[PDB]
């Protein structure tokens, strides 16, 4: 079903230290697979997932070139961006760029996006129909009128509806082995006393993929957010993710509290409890 | 692959 091809590009100017730094990271779903960094020992597009450790030199040279070229474009762009804002080379600035395509359950194009951000704030967005650009500012107007006039939407739309999709499929294929595997979370509940009156119940979800997951506590079979806490999902570092949910309970009421875990890799949602 | 053409702002 659902799957996505996404890239995240960052360019950061260093004013008396040469050309700005340029990084590109590629994801298929929640799996990174390539990267380019013009500061790495090898300033080339390089594989970041096992199933790309084979790809011919041709793919790599192509991508190293594409990233390089963009670095240059972005170098010019950082200088232009500084004029729209009335900026000297005094400080360093960031141009961000993201784009991706998403397939619906049928394995076909469902949505594409692309945007630009300057110094962390939205600057230019491709519209939802991929036909034109919107200055998400009024200082980005020149950029909007210039890209709408030169008909630049069209090249991005081709990439996002075709190329990106085509390639999304090659990558799934190259990595079907692991990319389509749904690793369910190893769940368990731990007990951490706070005092004689209360203690913390912590419900653990570990080693799962994809990152999407839902942890909730219930008390006596009712939704329960009072004295609840949920951490952001984090990467285990091995490709999988982690997450935990916490609820403050009175001594001897623990068996009233059940944790529920929803994940795409579980045949059905799991219900947990502290075994004492 | 990544997008082949990056806008000049």
């Amino acid at each position: 079903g659902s799957h996505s091809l996404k890239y995240f590009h960052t360019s950061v100017s260093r004013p008396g230290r040469g050309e700005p730094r340029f990084i590109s990271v590629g994801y298929v779903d929640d799996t990174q697979f390539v990267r380019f960094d013009n500061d790495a020992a090898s300033p080339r597009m390089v594989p970041r997932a096992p199933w790309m450790e084979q790809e011919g030199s041709e793919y790599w040279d192509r991508e190293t070139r594409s990233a390089r070229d963009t670095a240059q474009i972005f170098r010019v762009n950082l200088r232009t961006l500084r004029g729209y804002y009335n900026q000297s080379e005094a400080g360093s600035h960031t141009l961000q760029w993201m784009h991706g395509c998403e397939l619906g359950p049928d394995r076909r194009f469902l949505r594409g996006y692309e945007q630009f951000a300057y110094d962390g704030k939205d600057y230019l967005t491709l519209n939802e129909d991929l036909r034109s650009w919107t200055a998400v500012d009024t200082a980005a107007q020149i950029s909007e009128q210039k890209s709408n006039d030169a008909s630049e939407a069209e090249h991005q739309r081709a990439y996002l509806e075709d190329t990106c999709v085509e390639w999304l499929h090659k990558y799934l294929e190259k990595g079907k082995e692991t990319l389509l595997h749904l690793e369910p979370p190893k769940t368990h509940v731990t007990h951490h006393p706070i005092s004689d009156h209360e203690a913390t119940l912590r419900c653990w979800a570990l080693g799962f993929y994809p990152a999407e997951i839902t942890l909730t506590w219930q008390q006596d079979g009712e939704g329960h957010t009072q004295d609840t806490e949920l951490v952001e999902t984090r990467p285990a570092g091995d490709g999988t993710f982690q997450k935990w949910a916490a609820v403050v309970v009175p001594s001897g009421e623990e068996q009233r509290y059940t944790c529920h875990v929803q994940h795409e890799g579980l045949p059905e949602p799991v219900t947990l409890r502290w075994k004492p | 692959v990544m997008a082949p053409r990056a806008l000049l702002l």
Partner: protein, 97 residues
């Protein structure tokens, strides 16, 4: 606005068993950031980190990590400097979190 930080192991911590020490820094901007992993206040060497990426809100995120073997008495932390922090931010590893 300011960088969020989480310190944790890759695998459930068990004394004397080799593991991985993670410091997931995220929610920050700009991208220059100084992240050290400490062993008893002593900066650990040769720590690696993921490629720079970012969320839909443009804020960046990194995973710093290093091999490590947890003792009952050894202590580890993550010290983070960033322009948006008036002082270097420090969170210590709690194997319970």
């Amino acid at each position: 606005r300011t960088p969020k930080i989480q310190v944790y192991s890759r695998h459930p911590a068990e004394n004397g068993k080799s593991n991985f020490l993670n410091c997931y820094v995220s929610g920050f901007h700009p991208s220059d950031i100084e992240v050290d992993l400490l062993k008893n206040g002593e900066r650990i060497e040769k720590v690696e980190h993921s490629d720079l990426s970012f969320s839909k809100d443009w804020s960046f995120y990194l995973l710093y990590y290093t091999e490590f073997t947890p003792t009952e008495k050894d202590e580890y932390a993550c010290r983070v400097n960033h322009v948006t922090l008036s002082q270097p931010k420090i969170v210590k590893w709690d194997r319970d979190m």
